[PDB]
Amino acid sequence: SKQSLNIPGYSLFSDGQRVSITAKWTTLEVIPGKSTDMLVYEIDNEYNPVIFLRKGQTFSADFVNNSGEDSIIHWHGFRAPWKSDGHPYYAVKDGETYSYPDFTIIDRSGTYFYHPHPHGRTGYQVYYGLAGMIIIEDEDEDNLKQALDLEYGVTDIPLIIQDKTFDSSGQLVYNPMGHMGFWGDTILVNLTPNPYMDVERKIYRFRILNGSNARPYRLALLRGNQRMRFWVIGVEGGLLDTPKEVNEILVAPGERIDILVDFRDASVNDVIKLYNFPHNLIMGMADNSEFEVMEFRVTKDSAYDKSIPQRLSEVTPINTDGAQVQRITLGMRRMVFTINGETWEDGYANPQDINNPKVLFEQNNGDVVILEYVNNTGTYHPMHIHGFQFQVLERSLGPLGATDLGWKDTVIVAPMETVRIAVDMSHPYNEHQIYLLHCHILEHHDEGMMVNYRVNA
Ligand SMILES: [Cu+2]
Ligand SMILES: [Cu+2]
Ligand SMILES: [Cu+2]
Ligand SMILES: [Cu+2]
């Protein structure tokens, strides 16, 4: 029987007062009638709530580690000073606390992602439950919410999509084999299996966050056999300039796509499938199958008469005049993935001085750099950088679609593809920054497909 979609609780992070976030084990009912032991972040008496922030506020956090092993939280998408970013060098032992130095939220409104980042164990800790959404608000978001009467949990809905495998008793199975990362046989949305959500004939906002270890989704909305239109309005780095109408989106681990859906396109009593088509991005456990993710049930009319806005935000093109190119070649050396022929374990893992570790490349504050990913392997890699968003300039396999527009922080690099992104490495901090660059297939990350880079003060 289909279950109604669970909606996460939320936490309004205090502006400047220190909030405790505890990682701990508990027992949850995920499969109806069975118990599953899972990790959770507990904040403000909620498990894995959506963290709400306002641009400009002070972000003041403590991580309390009861996860059973070294851990640290990373705020995926934040422009943060690197000692507050959740770099693995700062992971604290089990039972200890990490006090994040305060910083100001300077990111654009949109959907962000908090999750653990320990050396070699990130795939395990996300998989077993440590993952949640962040929503940052600013004036463009205020204006959009009023334009459309969007309300969190009512018409503004997180879709945290994840694949897991359960045994008979309900215990999770985490058995990565091969080099495609971990692939699960059960699709969950907000830890809800086989979900449905009742909707009215009006516009909803869905915040799709791929919280899976390795599996990408090619998502469409099926009204019978026909694809329904919908609109991309935001990506990892916030709102696009104006809405982009699509009939599918490709979403890899680490990517976030904000969409609007107008169920006035459907009729009362329609069942609309959020459906996964083959991603076509691929020793391994991967598949390329199609399957339903969840369904929307149109139960009721609404007096709703708002329109999709003509404009959302300003997105300023990066000026790449004179930018230097930094080639980043993805390869493999004896069944391990490499970045410019190296792994994390080739001199990055145990620096003598964590403030001055090995870096693959180094930039000055304000440099505009073009990173050119060259995937010389047979599997895709969703390449993510900490510290900055970026703009995708070009793909060798084709033109840019809606989910690569705007400000991004994770870019799919398909097998044998070359992708150029432009990074404006301007930051407001007064010390040099050590930021990660790595694959967001979490088993690749754990195996060392990760480097530091440096941006001076
Ligand atoms: Cu991440
Ligand atoms: Cu990140
Ligand atoms: Cu990878
Ligand atoms: Cu990371």
Side-chain angles (χ1 to χ4, degrees), residues 337 379-383 439-441 444-445 449:
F337 291 112
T379 180
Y380 89 108
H381 303 278
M383 298 303 293
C439 181
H440 211 286
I441 293 167
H444 295 184
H445 165 280
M449 194 173 181

Side-chain angles (χ1 to χ4, degrees), residues 74 76 113 115 117 254 384 438 440:
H74 164 64
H76 174 149
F113 181 18
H115 68 71
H117 219 294
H384 168 56
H438 66 86
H440 211 286

Side-chain angles (χ1 to χ4, degrees), residues 74-77 113-117 122 126 210 253-256 384 386 409-410 438 440 442:
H74 164 64
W75 327 103
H76 174 149
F113 181 18
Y114 66 101
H115 68 71
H117 219 294
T122 290
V126 169
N210 182 339
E255 291 188 297
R256 284 92 65 199
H384 168 56
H386 294 210
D409 77 34
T410 300
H438 66 86
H440 211 286
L442 299 187

Side-chain angles (χ1 to χ4, degrees), residues 38-103:
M38 295 195 69
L39 286 162
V40 292
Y41 288 121
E42 170 168 14
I43 314 177
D44 291 332
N45 274 302
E46 294 284 349
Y47 290 164
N48 296 334
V50 177
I51 293 175
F52 271 82
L53 302 165
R54 182 88 199 176
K55 180 175 177 190
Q57 82 172 78
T58 294
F59 183 85
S60 189
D62 276 2
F63 165 49
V64 178
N65 186 9
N66 287 314
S67 66
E69 61 184 284
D70 289 5
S71 197
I72 189 74
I73 318 180
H74 164 64
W75 327 103
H76 174 149
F78 284 18
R79 290 170 186 261
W82 80 285
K83 292 174 186 170
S84 305
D85 176 50
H87 188 286
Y89 296 161
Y90 283 100
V92 295
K93 306 203 82 53
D94 189 40
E96 294 181 348
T97 290
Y98 186 75
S99 184
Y100 292 77
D102 282 5
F103 60 101

